[PDB]
Each structure stands twice: as structure tokens, then as C-alpha cells.
Amino acid sequence: VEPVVVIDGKGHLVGRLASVVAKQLLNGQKIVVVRAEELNISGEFFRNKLKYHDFLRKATAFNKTRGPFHFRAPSRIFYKALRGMVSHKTARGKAALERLKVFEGIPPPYDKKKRVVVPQALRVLRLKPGRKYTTLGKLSTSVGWKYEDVVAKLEAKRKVSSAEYYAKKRAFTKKVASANATAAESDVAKQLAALGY
Amino acid sequence: AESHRLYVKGKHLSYQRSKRVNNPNVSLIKIEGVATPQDAQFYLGKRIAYVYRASKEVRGSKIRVMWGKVTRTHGNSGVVRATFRNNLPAKTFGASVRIFLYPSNI
Amino acid sequence: STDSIVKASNWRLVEVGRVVLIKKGQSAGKLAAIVEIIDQKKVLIDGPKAGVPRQAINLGQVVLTPLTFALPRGARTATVSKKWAAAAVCEKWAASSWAKKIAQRERRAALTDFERFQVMVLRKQKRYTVKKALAKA
Amino acid sequence: AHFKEYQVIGRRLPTESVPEPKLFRMRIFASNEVIAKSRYWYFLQKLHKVKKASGEIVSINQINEAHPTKVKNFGVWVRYDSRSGTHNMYKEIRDVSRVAAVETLYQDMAARHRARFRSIHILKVAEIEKTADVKRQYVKQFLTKDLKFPLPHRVQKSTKTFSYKRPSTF
Amino acid sequence: DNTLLISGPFKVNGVPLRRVNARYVIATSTKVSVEGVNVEKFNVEYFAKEQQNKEIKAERVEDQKVVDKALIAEIKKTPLLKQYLSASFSLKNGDKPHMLKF
RNA sequence: UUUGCUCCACACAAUAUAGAUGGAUACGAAUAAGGCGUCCUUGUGGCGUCGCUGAACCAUAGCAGGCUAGCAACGGUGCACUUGGCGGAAAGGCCUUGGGUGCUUGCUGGCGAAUUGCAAUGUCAUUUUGCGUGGGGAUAAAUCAUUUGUAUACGACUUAGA
RNA sequence: AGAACUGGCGAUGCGGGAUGAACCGAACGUAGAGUUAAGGUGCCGGAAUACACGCUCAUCAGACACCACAAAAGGUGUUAG
RNA sequence: GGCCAGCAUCAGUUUUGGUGGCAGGAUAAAUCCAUAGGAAUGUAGCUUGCCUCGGUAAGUAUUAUAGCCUGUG
User: Fold this and answer.
1) Residues 29-48 of B with CB under 8 A from A
2) In sequence order, what are the residues at sequence separation of 6 or more whose Cβ sits closer than 8 angstroms to the Cβ of residue A170?
3) Residues of A with CB below 8 A from D164's CB?
4) Contact at 8 Å (CB) between C33 and C86?
């Protein structure tokens, strides 16, 4: 319904997000996913570490370079789980993965635009309460991503700049709503109410 | 003024297919803003056109058109089958295809 | 200021006489009153004035509305109908904002194209007075 | 499916020198008419020496509920076959009608004790008229006066694939 | 010949008398009265066409004026109806035509 | 290298498109909780109110959007300009001051439309170039051959020479 | 290793079991529309992130006959008897 | 009288809606109304540790200043 749709990555599950993203790419919609380091995995923390380690030891014996490249970044972990869903060996799969862009944090210019969420992939709508989850940002720090002390610092710089925008926006909406309230009771206002606006 | 659109835009999803065999004569068309097959009864028999551009001009136009129409509903999510005169070139998986409003049942 | 500020966390909770709205099914958007709770997930509902028949329903198919009124547990359809009039919940329902929102998107669907033109011409007139009132104060 | 409770009446065979066999009725829970005639001979062959070829069925009747909109406590006696030898079970269901209570029983047996339809025998389904003689605990807790319980953390099912609101619970 | 005979009117929106196929047309609900209009003399043989860019026969132009003068007096009664016929139609975003009552 | 190269606006050819056809419309956090509003003893405060879907909001009338006569307003918006800021994560954008110029459907009129003949997407975008118009701008290095041995199977590498 | 009755493979494709001479559906002129079998409906991948009652947390969970895995016996872990 | 098409009224096959009339059963069962009994997760009333201006208290009391269950019609 929009040309480029920006999905906020916070509070989602890896698999259930990557399913509904992979169908939209094969249908032609362009999706850019931001704030990858806030993504979540069901199950407790010590499980999902060992699901990474038995993956981490699987590499080509005669030459380690040629084997499965074990990527560490939370975008790259998520891009893996999506890449297995799209048929990436054909020409249809290569042109479907060029519609996707996945970032850690929110880089410019995507901070100025709206971010969306996917309700069938939220954690707080899917899992039962009283159930252990796992933060992907902590997970990649435990297996060799030397950037959580940097990405979290840039967010604390961003959110202060973002809080200044919202206060300016909220005061402007206050002037409009006051102007809209005094504009009411007029003859043009009452005819709209009959028609439903 | 700012808008001129008299059609309902829609994507080309895939061919009618099995797990290992497809039939290129029947195309599958997704219509935007249509959820259930009870809504898909409206678009049955409507005309479809696929519009695309080419370098060599044929009769004063660089723009070319294949025609087709909706035959029947498909599935529970409101997906729609379609048949064309000459079938869609299979490079168009995920391409905007126009669904017009005529022949008007209203 | 030696008081315990502990939050309440207010909730709509099921009981006898909690009036509800049926979102999907045969009824599709009608009011009804819970007569007797069966277990965790099923209840027993009845609304005679709206037109829903008395039936047992799952709590998945129903939504909870904040209005309540006094009614004895296990009442019959004549007794619910008499208590329904005394509370006058059909007047109290339309006073709420959530009932008005239902009626508004119902009316916007039934708008004729000519009436959809009249919505346009009025909003062109309304925005002219607002932008003069704005950007002065 | 939706079970329907049936009455089946059986009369062995009119023969010379034995006229008027007595008559034999049963109450059968079956999803339609044809199964309940076949479920009738499954029990009635166990009780005494008859066969379907040495038998005929007098009449079938659909027994509706006497009072649907009333809420009843039901105590059900169940015999069933396990992986080991068979053994009894008494369970209590709170429901709307008799024939809807057997629906929640077979789901309960298949969930906890892993018993299909063919293994279970229904002994007697009885309504407990007076309260405070309910034996089980999980039925008893709904009998407290002025029972009110909240439903926290409700999920919302939205049709569009994208929602912009950052959706919130109750 | 199964066509519909329509007029703009010509002064309101620039659509002259024209045969139009019945199937290619969405019919709304709003109506104007048509009782005063002479139309009857028009038939299939009238519109048969059988660089110069010659002007529409004088027979064609005079019939256009007589039909519209009876029709504008019907249009002027209801509010915004002259403005309604003059403006074009398009489908905006979020307009779902199966739900749209026309 | 017969005036090569670069940038600015236009002139015309050429070539393409994984797929424009009103608008990608900016808090963060929590979900056994919050958004907003208002007041105070500014706090884990009081009170009022909203959700139960974007089915929203904004924009939207005129020959694919013409030519003209007014009215009330001192607004809105398009455009080149200009006074200022701010933004480095992939800033390549976000604001704001001042005049200039068109437009305005906020309100009321007068003219123009046909013949594309009963539909035939009935073409209006955005990428790379090329070739000439007139308007600015800047006047270099690399390899081979030669030589050095911190190098070397041969290429490579490291040096030196108007 | 050797027999008994029936079906099949050998001589036989097609749909399903990822893959497979023997299992499941079904046996073949060339084509069009219609409905189904066995199997399936998160994504690859055509088709409900459909509905309904429960159970289960695994520091090697489990996922569908032929079939590619398992034994006795223990465990105040949990549930119904 | 070649080529590609659009609309009408029909015929063969087939999918998807709307809507009307009738038949059967415990002549559906219920709700509904009329009565007869009876109990509690005990309404009015009443007794009492009672008493923050009258809540509580836990007994009484079978429709009264709420209603429900069972049989019959």
C-alpha cells in the first residue's frame, strides 16, 4: 500500500517476523527493517546459545573458508533466517533479496520516517505470560559482535534528538485541536456531523 | 485533478501450480484491499490489462498491453485466478497489473 | 503524605449482569447480558431487547463492555428483559464514545458518491476558517 | 461431531412357541442415526446371546434436552481401555445440556489419558441436583457466591498485515 | 441497437449527445427528472457516420441546444448539482469499489 | 591525437526499466499496563477522558485541468530568491527570516469543449548516454625500455635517472 | 535357507512418501472447462499464521504408517484417576 | 470478403449468491404465560457481639421492598 515500508524490529520474534517479510518480498513490496539488536527469540537464554554453538562448529573440513560462513551481527543473523525462506538460488530469489535492507539501530534517512510493527509477530501478542524469551542483542555479544557498546550509545544520542521533535509536534497539535474545537458548532460543522465526519 | 485512476491495482503472484508442476495458462492475481472470497465475487469477469514499456515503437507507441479477465475465485484469502490471451511472461512475478471496472455489473 | 499510593489497575471483569457485545457469529454486533458464568472460557448470555437468542457462548467470540447493572444469577428471559428496561442501558450505550464510533463508520460506508462530493465541498470550506484562526494566535 | 443422544429399542425375534420377546432399550451417544443402531448391537451382544441377524430394532427416537438454557452440574461414570488393562473413572463436568457434556468428555479423555472414541464406554451420566455434594475440586470453585474473575492480557486479531499503532493490551 | 443515449449537458461538462454502451457504465442512485426533454426523434440512423475537420452539421448543433435548455432548468433546483456534473471522477487511495455504494 | 577535458542551464536523437499512476504521514517505554488533557504540595500526584484497529488522517472540483468578470478576506500553496541556523551512523536533509511572482474551489457569474464517431493502456513518469548550440573553468600522470637487490621460478616487489 | 493362497514389480508411466524397481492413490490417444483421490494448507510451495477443548519446557525437546531407531528400571517435574 | 475484437438474445456443461412455498419429529424441544410443591450460593423482614451516624456480625425467616428449581396444563 506504500512504496517502501519501514518495520521496527523491537519486540518481535525472529521466525514469525521473517515468514511474513519473505512473502512480501516475493510479492514485490520493498521492506527495510531497523533496530535489529532489539529482536527476540523464544526459549531461555542458555538454550539459544547452544543452538548457535552446534551451528558454529559446522564448517568444511578440508578448507574452512569454503564452509558455512557463521555471521555474527544481529542483522546478519536475522538475514540468515530470512534467506533460508526465499529460494535464493534462482533469479527470482536474487531479485527478491535486493528489495530488503536490514540495519542495526536506525540510520539516516530512516529516522525521519514512520516505523511500523507486525501484529502476528509481536512477542507480547504471541507468547504466553510467564515464559522465557531471549534478546538477540545480548546473544551476539556472547558469540563475538564487538559493537553493542557503540550501537546502544548512538541510540541514546538519537532518542534525545527525537524527544525534542515530539514535544514540538505535540504543542502544535494542541493549537490545532483548540482551533478545531472553536471552529465547531458552525453551520459547516453541523452538516458534516450528519454525514459522519 | 491530482488523480486519474479508474482501476484497481493488483500484483501478479504466480502460476496455477502443484508442488512440482505449474500450468502457465492460468495466472494468479492478488487484488489490494480484498480479504475474503465473498468480496471476490465482485471482480469476477472484470477486464485485466498488463501494461509495460519497450524501446522499439510499433504503431506510434512504446507502450504495449496484454488483455485478460478474471475467471473464478481462489483460496480463502481472496486470491483471484485469471486467464489472458497470451499468457504472462513469467518475469512478472511481483508486477503491478491493472484490474479495470468494466464490464459493469452495477 | 504518609499514604500508600499503590495503583489499582482497573479491569472489566466478568460477572452476572456484565453487558457485552458479540463481535462475530449470527448476532454480529448486538448487546447481550451475561446471565450465569459456566467456567473459565464459557458463559451464558441473553439479550431480549436487542434480539440475540439465549445461548451459551465462548468468551473468544465476545468482547467486554464497561456497563453493568444489578441482576440476580440464573435469571430467565422475562426477568432479564425487565431489568434491562430499569437500567435503560440502551440509552446509556449510545452516550458512550465507543458506540458513536461504530455508527460513524457505518454511515461512511453508506455514503452516495454525490454525498461523497458534498463531504468534499464542506471540508474545503471548513479548512478556510481554521487556517485563519490558526497562525494569528 | 455434534453428538445426538438416541433411544434404541430391540426385540430379538418373534418365533413360534416363543411369542413376545420382552423388549430392550438403551441410551446411545452417537453423531448420527446409523452409528447408533450399530452402537446398539455392540453393547447388547455383550449382555446376552443375540446377533444382528437374530435381531431387529423396534424404534429410534431423538431425545432432546429437557432444559437447555439451564446450567447443570453433571457427574459422569466412565469405563475405558488403556494400554494396560481397563479400569474405571469418575469425572464431573459443568455444562449446558446432556449431549454437549459428552462432547467435552471425549475431548478431556483424549487430551489427558490419550483415549480415542473406540476405547471409551459411557456408564451413566447423571445430573447433581443439590449443590455442596460435588466431589471434585475444579468444579467446586465456581460454586462460590458472587464469583467475579478478570480476563487479563487479551490479544487482538487484526486483519491487515501491518499495524501502525504499536498495539496495546487490555 | 442496445446503446444508451446520453447528454452531458454540453454546457456543463463538454459531453455532447452520444451513443454509449450500457455495459461500460456505472449507474449511480441520484436522479433528475427527464420529462420535459424532446428526445424521441433520435434513433440509430441519426448517429451513423456513413484532415478537413468539418464542423458538426448545423442540424447537430441546434439539437444539442434544444435538449440542454430543457435540462439545465431541471439541474438548477437541487444544491451543488451543476458543480457535481462538471467535476470528474477518480478512485483515491483506500477506495474499495466492492464496498463503495455508487 | 587537428581544440582535447570539465561544470551550468536547452536543443534533439539514442537507450533502457524485477515494474511511479494523490501522499513511505518520524517520540520513547510498558503490556498484571498506558496515550492525551488539566490542576497542584512537580510526585511512582489528583481529576477528567480515549482505545476494543489505518474502515483513520491529510490531500482532493476546473481542456491531463482552458480563457475571463467579480466578492469577502490579509489566509493557504507553487516558485525561483534571501537572512539565518541545525544534522557525521549511510550528515547529502530537516527548519526558519524577509520581500518578489503566479495560483486559489472561501463566495457568485459569463464564455470554450462535439468528429477519438458504442471500448481498444490511448501514451503525460525515471535511468544511462550521445551529438551540436552559449556560459563559466582548469593546463597531468602511469606502464615499457633502462638501472638498483631490502626482492625474485617467470609476472610481481623495492629503488634511481631531463 | 525352503514352501503355501492372493496382489504387485519384472514389461508401467502419472499424483503422494524430500530422495527410492516392490508402499499409498490411480493404470496413459491429442486438447479445453469441472470435481476429487492419496497427501497437505507459517515460508520455501498452489492452499485457513482458520475455529474448539486440553496436555507438554527438555544444560542433545518433538513432529505422521512401510522407514532409517531403541531396553528394563528409576524421577515430591506436572496432570488427571 | 482477410485479420483481431465489443455488446445483445439463446443452447450444452458448471461454479457462486439471493429468496418464496410445503413435509416430518415429544405434531421438535425451549423461551412465554396459568398452577401445584420444594430447596439454597437464603431476597424482604426480624433476633443479637452489635454500632465511625448505620455497616458489619451469624442466626432466624421460604417471596415479602430480588428471583430461581421440579411436576402438571
Assistant:
1) 30, 32
2) none
3) 114, 116-117
4) no
The residue count of chain B comes to 106
Residue found under cell 428483559: C81
User: Distance (Å, rounded) from C-alpha E40 to C-alpha E52?
Assistant: 31
Identify the experimental approach.
cryo-EM
Report yes or no: C13 and D150 within 8 Å, Cβ to Cβ. Answer: yes
Rounded-to-integer distance, Cα E5 and Cα D163, Å: 48
CB pairs under 8 A between A and C: 39
Q: How many CA atoms lie within 13 A of C26 on its CB side?
A: 7
Q: Do B94 and A28 touch (CB under 8 A)?
A: yes
* Structural domains of chain A, count: 2
The class of domain B1-106 in CATH terms is mainly beta
Query: How far apart are the C-alpha atoms of A51 and A41, rounded to whole Å?
Result: 12
What kind of architecture, by CATH, is found in domain D69-145?
Roll (3.10)
CB contact under 8 A, A175 and C137: yes
In this structure, the answer to whether residues A154 and A115 fall within a common structural domain is no
Q: Is the CB of D133 under 7 A from strand H?
A: no
> Taking CB atoms and an 8 Å limit, are D150 and C56 in contact across chains?
no
**Contact, B75 CB vs strand G, < 7 Å:** yes
> Is C19 exposed, middle or buried, given 0-12, 13-18 or 19+ CB atoms closer than 10 A?
buried
